[PDB]
Amino acid sequence: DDHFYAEYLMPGLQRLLDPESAHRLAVRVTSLGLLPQDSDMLEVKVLGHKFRNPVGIAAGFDKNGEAVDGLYKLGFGFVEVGSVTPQPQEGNPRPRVFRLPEDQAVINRYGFNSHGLSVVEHRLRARQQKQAQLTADGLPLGINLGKNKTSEDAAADYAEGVRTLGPLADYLVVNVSSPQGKTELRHLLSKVLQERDALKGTRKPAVLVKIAPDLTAQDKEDIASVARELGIDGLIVTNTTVSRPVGLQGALRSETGGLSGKPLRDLSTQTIREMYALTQGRIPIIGVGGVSSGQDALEKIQAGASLVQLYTALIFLGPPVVVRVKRELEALLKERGFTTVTDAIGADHRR
Ligand SMILES: Cc1cc2nc3c(=O)[nH]c(=O)nc-3n(C[C@H](O)[C@H](O)[C@H](O)COP(=O)(O)O)c2cc1C
Ligand SMILES: Cc1c(-c2ccc(-c3ccccc3F)cc2)nc2ccc(F)cc2c1C(=O)O
Ligand SMILES: O=C(O)c1cc(=O)[nH]c(=O)[nH]1
Ligand code: NA
Ligand code: NI
Numbered sequence: 001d002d003h004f005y006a007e008y009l010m011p012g013l014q015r016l017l018d019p020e021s022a023h024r025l026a027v028r029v030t031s032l033g034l035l036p037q038d039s040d041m042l043e044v045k046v047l048g049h050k051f052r053n054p055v056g057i058a059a060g061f062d063k064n065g066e067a068v069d070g071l072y073k074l075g076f077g078f079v080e081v082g083s084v085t086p087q088p089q090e091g092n093p094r095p096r097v098f099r100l101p102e103d104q105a106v107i108n109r110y111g112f113n114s115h116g117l118s119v120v121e122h123r124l125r126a127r128q129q130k131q132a133q134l135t136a137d138g139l140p141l142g143i144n145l146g147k148n149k150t151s152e153d154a155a156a157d158y159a160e161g162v163r164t165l166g167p168l169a170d171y172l173v174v175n176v177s178s179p180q181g182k183t184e185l186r187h188l189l190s191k192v193l194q195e196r197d198a199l200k201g202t203r204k205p206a207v208l209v210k211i212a213p214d215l216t217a218q219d220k221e222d223i224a225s226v227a228r229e230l231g232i233d234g235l236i237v238t239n240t241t242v243s244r245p246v247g248l249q250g251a252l253r254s255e256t257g258g259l260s261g262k263p264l265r266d267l268s269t270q271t272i273r274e275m276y277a278l279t280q281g282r283i284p285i286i287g288v289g290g291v292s293s294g295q296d297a298l299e300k301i302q303a304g305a306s307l308v309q310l311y312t313a314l315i316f317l318g319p320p321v322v323v324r325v326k327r328e329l330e331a332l333l334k335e336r337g338f339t340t341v342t343d344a345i346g347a348d349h350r351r
Pocket of ligand 2: 009010013014017018019020022023025026029030034035097099106314315316318319
């Protein structure tokens with residue numbers, strides 16, 4: 001029930017623990033399955049895969065692939081693992097996670113705390129068989145690849161992620177947004193796609209680029225330009241923002257890092273519209289940023305998203321939020337004339 005979690009449970013956990021401790025606890029609980037129907041309307045085919053429902057869990061929750069199965073159990077149409085780095089790295093010194101309850105927002109500067117490719121690969125291979133079945137059933141797995149803080153070759157770091165986890169991923173994600181020109185971007189992504197095309201004995205995973213909501217007009221044109229030029233399979237809009245919107249009440253708003261949650265809701269959707277227009281609706285887009293209801297989800301899809309993802313909403317509303325968003329999205333699609341989710345993609349631009 002939505003009320004119990006929002007009014008009591010989540011608030012209870014927030015007074016007993018600091019955000020990073022709660023995050024780790026959330027992962028334990030989710031991976032153990034101490035948790036507990038998708039219509040055909042929500043089914044989305046894109047990126048060469050089938051998704052029973054368009055609501056996935058965004059990268060950052062399960063950084064080391066410890067709770068994949070638990071996440072699907074919570075109702076997610078797809079799971080995106082970590083932001084995994086080649087070598088293990090501790091990340092920024094603590095505290096590095098801050099709660100903004102009144103804003104239904106969070107601010108983090110984790111710095112890519114990661115177990116590493118070796119560990120995540122081992123874990124994911126251990127369940128490769130189960131995931132194979134999951135994928136076949138419209139529950140794809142995404143893997144977000146990062147790079148080490150001290151690494152010298154960014155492209156080499158990502159490429160290594162493609163080789164090690166490409167065989168295990170349904171789709172891969174390269175960041176360029178965690179809180180440089182059109183040429184440096186083109187070289188990085190071409191080497192990644194080349195490594196992807198070099199894979200064998202495995203189904204080639206789609207490659208998407210995740211961008212920040214903090215981009216200049218030139219940044220968006222360049223990203224759109226390179227994406228179409230290289231044939232990027234998609235884009236994830238949007239990642240956290242460094243800006244602090246006028247109206248933030250949280251006492252920790254002055255904290256450095258990326259802001260997620262409701263404050264990022266519309267900035268995320270507007271970026272989706274802009275990127276969708278710059279790519280002429282030719283590049284599938286996964287919309288993320290402040291999704292907390294079916295309606296927020298529909299606004300992202302109409303702006304141009306084929307799929308959406310959420311994270312912060314789960315932090316304050318808990319598991320029930322996943323069920324509520326899907327239920328509302330379905331009800332709204334009907335009410336607004338769309339026979340399927342696919343029909344609403346890019347509806348804003350079509351007028
Ligand atoms: C605590 C935290 C950790 C995150 N870690 C990652 C990460 O490792 N890699 C990544 O690509 N995005 C990361 N993100 C960003 C989310 O994937 C997402 O882009 C952003 O939070 C917007 O969605 P939301 O408002 O629904 O949370 C993180 C976000 C939060 C709040
Ligand atoms: C409470 C919380 C949780 C969480 C989410 C879901 C659950 C959960 C999951 C499954 C079943 C029951 C539950 F309560 C438990 C705990 N995850 C986070 C992740 C990142 C972050 F920065 C902060 C948090 C915070 C926080 O406010 O400190
Ligand atoms: O680990 C992190 O700091 C991090 C990475 C990223 O892509 N986004 C975010 O909000 N935090
Ligand atoms: Na526009
Ligand atoms: Ni694969």
